[PDB]
C-alpha cells in the first residue's frame, strides 16, 4: 500500500539537520556491523527501525535529510523537533569528530592514513536491549547473517509498525516477550543455532535477577569496569559482547571489543604481540591486553578509533 520515500518522490516529508559529509557517512557508519537493523532500499536512501518507528535517511556533502513513517493510519507529515533530537542523540551529533580524528591521528600513522578514504565515521547511541541481543547472536557469526536472524527475531517477538512494499517492519521485543517456556524452540526454529538459549536466558535472568530495562540504564551511568563486569555474568555475554554494548549503547566510548577481528587488524597493521601472555594466539588475559594496548594508544575514545578501522577493514 505505501511506499518507501526518496527525497524526489516526496521532497515535502523531509527535514533537514546540518551536518557535514566529514562528521557521518552514513554508508560507512549504518553498515559497518553497528546496528543490523538499516538497509539501502534505493540507492543513497537508508530505511530502518528506531525506537517503535520507521526513517528514512540520505545526505549531500552538508546536509543530513530526514523522514519519519508513523505507522499507524494517521497524517503523514515531517519530523518533529522531539523526533529529530532521537536523530541527534542516535548518531551522537555532539562530539566532534573532526577533532578526534586529528587527536587518533597525532599519535598513529596507519590511521591518519586510514582516515583519509574513511571520514564521517562515528558511534551510534543504540538501545541497549537492541544491542545486547543482537551482539548474542553475532558469535561466530557474519553481518548477513545477524541481520537475518535479528529481523527474523523482531517480526516473531515483537509488534508490527508499518508495511512499505514488501518489507514489514517490526519494533524489538521487549524482555518478557523472549524469556517465554517456548521461546528458545521459537528461535532455533527462526535458525539461531545455540543463540536461542542465550537469549531467552539473559531475557530471563535480566528481568529476575536484575529487574528488567532500568538495569540497562544504571549501567549507563555506572563506570565502564562495574557495568563490564555486571553484563558478563549475563548468559552467553563475554567480554567481546559485554565491551559492544558498553561501546555502543552505555556510553563507554573507551571500551574495545577484542575478538579475533581486532587481532587480525593489531598485528598486521600495528605489529602487536601479547607481551605478558605466554602463549601467542587469543586467550582471555591477552584480549584483556590489547583492549588496553588500543587505550593507551588512542585514549578515552578508543572504541570510536576502533570503529573507524573496522569500517574501513570491511571495504576491501
Ligand atoms: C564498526 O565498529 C565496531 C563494530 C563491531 N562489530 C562486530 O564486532 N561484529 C561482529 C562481526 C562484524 N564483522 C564481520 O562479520 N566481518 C568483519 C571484519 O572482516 C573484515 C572486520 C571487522 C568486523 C567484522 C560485524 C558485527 C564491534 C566493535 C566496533 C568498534
Ligand atoms: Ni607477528
Redesign the pocket.
Known sequence: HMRHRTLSSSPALWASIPCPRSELRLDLVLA???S?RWKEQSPAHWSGVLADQVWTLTQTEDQLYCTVYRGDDSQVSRPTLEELETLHKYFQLDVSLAQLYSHWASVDSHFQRVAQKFQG?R?LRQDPTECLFS?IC?SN???AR?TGMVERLCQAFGPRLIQLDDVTYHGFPNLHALAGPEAETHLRKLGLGYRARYVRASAKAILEEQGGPAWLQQLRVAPYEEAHKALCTLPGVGA?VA??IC??ALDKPQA??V?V?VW??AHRDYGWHPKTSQAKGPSPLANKELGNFFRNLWGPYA??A??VL??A??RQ
Open positions: 559497518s556491523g553497528q543490523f565515521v558511534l551482539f553475532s557469526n557474519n553481518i545477524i567481546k565491551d559492544c561501546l555502543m574495545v571489543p575478538d577481528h587480525q587488524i572504541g570510536w576502533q570503529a573496522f569500517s577493514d570491511l
